Design a protein around this ligand. Sequence first.
Ligand code: ZN
Ligand code: ZN
Ligand code: ZN
Ligand code: ZN
Ligand code: ZN
Ligand code: ZN
Lengths: 26, 26, 26, 26
Amino acid sequence: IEELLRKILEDDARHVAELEDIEKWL
Amino acid sequence: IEELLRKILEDDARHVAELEDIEKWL
Amino acid sequence: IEELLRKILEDDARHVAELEDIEKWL
Amino acid sequence: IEELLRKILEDDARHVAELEDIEKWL
Ligand SMILES: [Zn+2]
Ligand SMILES: [Zn+2]
Ligand SMILES: [Zn+2]
Ligand SMILES: [Zn+2]
Ligand SMILES: [Zn+2]
Ligand SMILES: [Zn+2]
């Protein structure tokens, strides 16, 4: 469970960065 | 941008799946 | 913990729907 | 679209925060 939660956390951190990039580009 | 959004949404679909399993294990 | 996980799951399901909408609109 | 993306990214920032606390409680 801890490893799966860590990876979801990782994904969401990355999603924040990606979405901020997309906001700039739009 | 469209491709990147697609990847992000595929991640969230996977997150639903993983969170649902984590609920079961907990 | 279960209630917090349920709400994250909810959010991600909604995010899938929202991102599919944004893909259509783009 | 830009406003909706902003809301989605704010959610993911909150998800990081919630997942981090869940890791601590677990
Ligand atoms: Zn995310
Ligand atoms: Zn997610
Ligand atoms: Zn499952
Ligand atoms: Zn999400
Ligand atoms: Zn999320
Ligand atoms: Zn915290």
